[PDB]
Amino acid sequence: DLNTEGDALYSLRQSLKDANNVLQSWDPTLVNPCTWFHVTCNPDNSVIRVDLGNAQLSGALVPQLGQLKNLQYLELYSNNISGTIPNELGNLTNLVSLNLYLNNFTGFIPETLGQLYKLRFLRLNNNSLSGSIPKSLTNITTLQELALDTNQLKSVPDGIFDRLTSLQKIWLHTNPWDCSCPRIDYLSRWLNKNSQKEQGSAKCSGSGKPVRSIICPTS
Numbered sequence: 001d002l003n004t005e006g007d008a009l010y011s012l013r014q015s016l017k018d019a020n021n022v023l024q025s026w027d028p029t030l031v032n033p034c035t036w037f038h039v040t041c042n043p044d045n046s047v048i049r050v051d052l053g054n055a056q057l058s059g060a061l062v063p064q065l066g067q068l069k070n071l072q073y074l075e076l077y078s079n080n081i082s083g084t085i086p087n088e089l090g091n092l093t094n095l096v097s098l099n100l101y102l103n104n105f106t107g108f109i110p111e112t113l114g115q116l117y118k119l120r121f122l123r124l125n126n127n128s129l130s131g132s133i134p135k136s137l138t139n140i141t142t143l144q145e146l147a148l149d150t151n152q153l154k155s156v157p158d159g160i161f162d163r164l165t166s167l168q169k170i171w172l173h174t175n176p177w178d179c180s181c182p183r184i185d186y187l188s189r190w191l192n193k194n195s196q197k198e199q200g201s202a203k204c205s206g207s208g209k210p211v212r213s214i215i216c217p218t219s
């Protein structure tokens with residue numbers, strides 16, 4: 001009997017590159033992947049977290065990774081994972097923490113990420129993600145820590161942070177933010193009103209000014 005979770009997890013092994021045989025224990029012919037290293041399962045023998053931080057992994061992620069229904073912690077930080085973030089990651093309903101920082105992800109941030117209504121920690125920092133931040137992120141009301149620094153983000157949809165009443169920390173620095181008025185109006189005012197939330201200082205592209213300092217005139 002094929003475990004389906006291990007099958008989905010084996011699809012990830014088939015595309016990644018070790019180079020260290022970190023995934024040597026990932027044998028899908030077993031009854032379940034709960035005895036796999038870097039993999040924890042619940043008492044119902046279902047994968048609830050994947051810890052592959054600092055494993056020197058190359059390659060791209062797979063759409064099969066969204067098959068893990070009971071996944072809570074996806075730790076893929078500190079690797080050389082390239083390509084775009086799969087939209088199927090928005091299927092991870094029970095995902096609490098998505099750690100994808102320190103990789104080489106490109107493209108846009110998936111709008112399907114807003115379907116993660118249990119997500120409390122989202123770290124996509126230190127990548128090459130281009131703007132802008134998905135509008136559906138406003139639906140993640142449980143979001144507490146949002147790390148998006150060190151990317152290529154340019155803008156923000158107006159009023160996106162307003163429904164985020166559980167937001168504690170937010171990283172936005174090191175990004176080519178478009179500080180042209182009236183586009184930067186909302187982000188400038190929000191970061192000023194929630195300066196205790198912003199970790200580091202988001203700079204404006206070109207001028208290098210903190211966007212919190214920008215005051216857009218009307219007419």
Ligand SMILES: *[C@@H]1O[C@H](CO)[C@@H](O)[C@H](O)[C@H]1NC(C)=O
Nearest residue numbers: 066067087088089090091112
């Ligand atoms: C996974 O998400 C994609 C959207 O990116 C969707 O088309 C697909 O049906 C989802 N799969 C499951 C099993 O929910």
